[PDB]
Design an enzyme around this catalytic site. Structure first.
Site, PDB file in Angstrom:
ATOM      1  N   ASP A 187       0.763  -1.253   0.000  1.00 46.68           N
ATOM      2  CA  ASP A 187       0.000   0.000   0.000  1.00 46.68           C
ATOM      3  C   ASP A 187       0.794   1.304   0.000  1.00 46.68           C
ATOM      4  O   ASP A 187       0.311   2.327  -0.484  1.00 46.68           O
ATOM      5  CB  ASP A 187      -1.033   0.020   1.119  1.00 46.68           C
ATOM      6  CG  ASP A 187      -2.159  -0.987   0.902  1.00 46.68           C
ATOM      7  OD1 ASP A 187      -2.377  -1.433  -0.246  1.00 46.68           O
ATOM      8  OD2 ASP A 187      -2.829  -1.331   1.894  1.00 46.68           O
TER       9      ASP A 187
ATOM     10  N   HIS B  78      -9.712  -0.264  -3.278  1.00 44.84           N
ATOM     11  CA  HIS B  78      -8.511  -0.485  -4.087  1.00 44.84           C
ATOM     12  C   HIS B  78      -8.825  -1.357  -5.290  1.00 44.84           C
ATOM     13  O   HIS B  78      -9.465  -2.394  -5.126  1.00 44.84           O
ATOM     14  CB  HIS B  78      -7.444  -1.197  -3.256  1.00 44.84           C
ATOM     15  CG  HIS B  78      -6.968  -0.411  -2.076  1.00 44.84           C
ATOM     16  ND1 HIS B  78      -6.108  -0.934  -1.136  1.00 44.84           N
ATOM     17  CD2 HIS B  78      -7.220   0.862  -1.693  1.00 44.84           C
ATOM     18  CE1 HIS B  78      -5.854  -0.018  -0.217  1.00 44.84           C
ATOM     19  NE2 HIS B  78      -6.514   1.082  -0.534  1.00 44.84           N
TER      20      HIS B  78
ATOM     21  N   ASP C  51      -6.888  -3.329  -6.586  1.00 50.37           N
ATOM     22  CA  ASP C  51      -6.265  -4.635  -6.467  1.00 50.37           C
ATOM     23  C   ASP C  51      -7.127  -5.641  -5.722  1.00 50.37           C
ATOM     24  O   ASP C  51      -6.789  -6.808  -5.649  1.00 50.37           O
ATOM     25  CB  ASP C  51      -4.817  -4.567  -5.925  1.00 50.37           C
ATOM     26  CG  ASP C  51      -4.739  -4.261  -4.433  1.00 50.37           C
ATOM     27  OD1 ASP C  51      -5.777  -4.158  -3.764  1.00 50.37           O
ATOM     28  OD2 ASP C  51      -3.604  -4.143  -3.925  1.00 50.37           O
TER      29      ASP C  51
END
Ligand SMILES: [Ca+2]
Ligand SMILES: [Ca+2]
Ligand SMILES: [Ca+2]
Ligand SMILES: [Ca+2]
Lengths: 636, 636
Positions: free
Chosen positions: B334, B439, B441
């Site tokens: 992160d 996010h 991801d």
């Protein structure tokens, strides 16, 4: 554009289909556990293909065909026409287990097809074409496309919007959008100070146009009407390109789907048009004159009569302005600059105004906003040129400055940035800071060569003046007096002899000629000029305490150019055989080229000349025939 | 480049001639009044042409030829080689009246020719070529030219400058510059925070390199040495391209002439080189892995053993980091992003760092700087793609956001602007704001297809998970329990039945699948992907009070990709025949393609899974083979 729409396990899915897209449809997720195969039916205006592992086959409206259920076997759904009230547009999928040929379940897809397109004139012919494929981009050049916006340089009426660009939202479909959909027009927060958009919200109550997008308004819900419909919008730019702003803005329309309270609406479909705001463009002396603007004190009679006599030789009109408390003596020249903007549909002249102390007819747009280098006498523009194979079809803007390491004056960054950001005139800095006042118009100008497409650069030259005076002295004219008829100069008794014998003045003027020559070299380099393109006019300067120049006699290079006719400041030079030897020398340079010289006396009313001119002139000209959007500027 | 040099009335002019220019010389001004004609002599290494009204003829070193004195008859003076101590380089002009053939006066021009060139490697081979004609411009593409600068991401030594770009001032000439000249290197105030330049000021006292241009230093006088000389400079960029900065900087050298005290020096000659600062570039999952960085609490043993076992299957090295007080549990993923910069001579990996609370080896450059969308888990980049004929050889950066009218979260403008300004990865915004953490991801990743040049997009899919669970239930496995071995989950007794019977969770997950599908569509559009390029991995989410998703079981899509070997978070799914049905389903999708799956348990050490992952990984990869400067980005 392919769009994902899934059949829903044990239930019907209803969806809007937007023409110009197609759907890929997962039928496998909706299948009951244990189901083996599927079959499908569909209506007349829905086209369905079964796509298995990349192989797509068209399927009939009602067949009995079955396919194995697989995650890699999907549907592709296409519609070529918008739904009407007589439509039932649907696809129904049945599922079978390994046992029976009777369906164990079915999942449907019910569609409503609409056309939605935000249209602009992106092909730059003045008319808004249907859904130009390139409308979402902006490209320069002859083959370039994308729409153009004018800055507006001035509840609303229909007539008042004549100068804006049209944008039309074209739709086609049934009487109403299905439940839970709405159409929204929007812009970014960033563009919200660049643009404004008007439209009639309630047409049944009138034609009143209201401002729906712009400062403080980022979105507007537009009302959907069934059948074939067009909503007409008018779009204005709020500002010119500048340091932080490329000139490009975007406007979007989205079909939004209502999900549930507290959850954002989903953008089902989005269409985008881009606009470029048209740059402000300057007009060089070769362009045809339209109006001549002059300012002088009310009693300078010779000046007004002679300027009027000049303009009467042409087809121009004269506009006379007088002095103001808040403006300089030269303000029409120094505080005002005539330029133009153009879009395919319309263009107008646009004046830049920078009043000395702060604050020309309705046909003009007006853009209103420090050392003397900030004055517009310090701003010029060349005729079209080609330099080292690179063409500048609108010419290049010229701005006076000081050497980089000098610590001298420079035009303010804000104005310099503005001119650079217009991009189409690719500005060049010259050296004006050797002049007390500091304006490029004190030392240089351009004139067309009559009967041709060519032009000359005129340069002030002290060496030319000294050569001429030395000749006349050799000829026995050394006692010839200057400033004849200016009573306040008389006691000085300035003659050719007295000028030539002044040693410090000679050295000062050799230095100023170096300054002029440095400019000559930059001009030749950046404009692609040779010595054949240049004429030197005699000039003379005195130096001040800062080692800067002011005119000894009126600078003849700063002249009114109306095609073949040139208004030239009267120099009051030495009289030989009862003619000014400076006037005679200048005629001899210019007249053989077909240029007609008229000398204009702006100083007699003041009785003397100390280096300052108390009148000003500015000429409004026709824009270039070449369209700015046809240019291909270097990428910045 | 033509340069103006005038003979001076009754006196000799001495001037420096810079090779690569030539002079036009007015001989008429220097002529005495009454003089009729002129003749000239010149030395061996000066070439002289008489140019009359455009017609140029070469003149011998000593002839007797005479020409009429005219303002339109001038000289053109050229030299092909620099002066030495044995030179006497001159042109002498004699003047005659109408009476005699004996000169009545003469004016000379005495020249000193020097070569001055500021050279850079503009052809991008790593070596500084002599005077590249294009060195003053910067152009993209295979045939493009102009020099490249690296940002420095860390009295000075010679070794410490290895990473900078070379710039060499090459000169040739006699022992000394003539009186009143100096050579000055300079930059603009604006570029002064973009660049820095080093050089040895006093080489007789050592090799010590000093910083001569940069913050607070806009110019440096360089010492002239006679003969053929080169001064070596090293140049560093101070910052990456950004919102207000294109990446382009300029450096100038001028020969300046001393005029007199109190007056600025005149720039006789100026040479300019331009640099572009190399952009920061991200590496997609298809690029070869070099090092795998992981962070976890010291006691998560299974995680460390299994990650080590994975990396040992490859040629990568493992770097283990533990937790910090100022950083999140995931910080390696992160708070850190691995990317690179490259210039023809050198390149290095460069890490972007954004510590949660504020503040990897010497081989790296380090660039250090709000909602969860600012985390680098929200930043990804695609493999190289071609979209509608437009190639993106470095791929495209992907950033999670919210719908435009939503009022939801968005990555900060500063970071977004930074990524856009790198230009070469042409970023795309996706929709991540339906996720609690937010996010990209969490929902998507890319994997190469082994043995080919192709890749797949992997998408999380709730519909895939429900289909699988419904099958297993149909098969009689409804009582199969999840989270086996997590003691803190046991009292929940979550089974397939309990999941499938939860009605609100079903509706929540249908909604999340719409969110995923909206992303699928943007990805297909902006990356030019078809359904053949995509694999769906089962996922499941729970909804929070804000109507946003968090993982119900670990998101398998966020995985360690080392070529064929994939570390996949262990899902802890329902056990059928003593194997996780989620692991078995995923193997069945991936393994036939040659991808080898290893499931990595990062949650057992915590005894339960609430939707948060306490470990992170990041992979450092080799840069693209394609050189960024070979790209042709769209003009912004
Ligand atoms: Ca049109
Ligand atoms: Ca002007
Ligand atoms: Ca090279
Ligand atoms: Ca990342």
């Amino acid at each position: 554009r392919e769009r994902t729409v899934r059949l829903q396990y044990g239930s019907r899915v209803e969806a809007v289909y937007v023409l110009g897209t197609y759907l890929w449809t997962d039928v496998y997720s909706a299948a009951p556990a244990g189901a083996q195969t599927f079959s499908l039916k569909h209506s007349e205006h829905v086209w369905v293909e079964v796509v298995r592992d990349g192989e797509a086959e068209e399927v009939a409206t009602n067949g009995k065909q079955r396919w194995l259920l697989s995650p890699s076997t999907t549907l592709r759904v296409t519609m070529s026409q918008a739904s009407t009230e007589a439509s039932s547009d649907k696809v129904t999928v049945n599922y079978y287990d390994e046992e029976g040929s009777i369906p164990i379940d079915q999942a449907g897809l019910f569609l409503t097809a609409i056309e939605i397109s935000l249209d602009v004139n992106a092909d730059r012919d003045g008319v808004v074409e249907k859904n130009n494929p390139k409308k979402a981009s902006w490209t320069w050049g002859p083959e370039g496309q994308g729409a153009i916006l004018l800055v507006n340089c001035d509840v609303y009426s229909k007539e008042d919007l004549k100068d804006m660009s049209q944008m039309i939202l074209r739709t086609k479909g049934p009487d109403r959008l299905p439940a839970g959909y709405e159409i929204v027009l929007y812009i970014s927060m960033s563009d919200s100070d660049k643009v404004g958009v008007f439209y009639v919200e309630n047409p049944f109550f009138g034609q009143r146009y209201i401002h729906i997008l712009g400062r403080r308004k980022l979105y507007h819900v537009v009302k959907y009407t069934g059948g074939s419909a067009e909503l007409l919008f008018f779009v204005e730019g709020l500002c010119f390109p500048d340091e932080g702003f490329s000139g490009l803005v975007s406007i979007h329309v989205s079909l939004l789907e209502y999900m549930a309270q507290d959850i954002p609406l989903t953008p089902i479909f989005t269409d985008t048009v881009i606009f470029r705001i048209a740059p402000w463009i300057m007009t060089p002396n070769i362009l045809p004159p339209v109006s001549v603007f002059v300012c002088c004190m009310k009693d300078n009679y010779l000046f007004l009569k002679e300027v009027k006599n000049l303009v009467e030789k042409t087809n121009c009109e004269l506009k006379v302005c007088f002095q103001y408390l808040n403006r300089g003596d030269r303000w029409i020249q120094d505080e005002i600059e005539f330029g133009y903007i153009e879009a395919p549909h319309k263009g107008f002249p646009v004046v830049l105004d920078s009043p000395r102390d702060g604050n020309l007819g309705p046909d003009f747009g007006y853009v209103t906003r420090v050392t003397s280098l900030d004055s517009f006498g310090n701003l010029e523009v060349s005729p079209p040129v080609t330099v080292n194979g690179k063409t500048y079809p609108l010419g290049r803007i010229l701005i006076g400055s000081s050497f980089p390491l000098s610590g001298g004056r420079r035009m303010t960054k804000v104005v310099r940035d503005f001119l650079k950001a217009q991009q189409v005139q690719a500005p060049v800095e010259l050296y004006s800071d050797w002049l007390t006042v500091g304006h490029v118009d004190e030392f240089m100008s351009f004139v067309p060569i009559p009967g041709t497409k060519k032009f000359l650069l005129l340069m002030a030259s002290t060496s030319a003046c000294y050569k001429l005076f030395r000749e006349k002295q050799k000829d026995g004219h050394g006692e010839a007096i200057m400033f004849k008829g200016l009573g306040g100069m008389s006691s000085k008794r300035i003659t050719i002899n007295k000028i030539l014998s002044n040693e410090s003045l000679v050295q000062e003027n050799l230095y100023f000629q170096r300054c002029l020559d440095w400019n000559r070299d930059i001009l030749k380099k950046e404009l692609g000029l040779t010595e054949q393109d240049i004429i030197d006019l005699p000039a003379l300067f005195k130096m001040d305490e800062d080692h800067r120049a002011r005119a000894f006699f009126p600078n003849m290079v700063n002249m009114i150019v109306l095609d073949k006719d040139l208004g030239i400041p009267k120099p009051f030079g030495p009289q030989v055989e009862e003619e000014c030897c400076l006037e005679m020398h200048v005629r001899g340079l210019l007249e053989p080229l077909g240029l007609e010289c008229t000398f204009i006396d702006d100083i007699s009313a003041y009785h003397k000349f100390l280096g300052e001119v108390h009148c000003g002139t500015n000429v409004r000209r026709k824009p270039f025939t070449f369209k700015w959007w046809h240019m291909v500027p270097s990428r910045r």
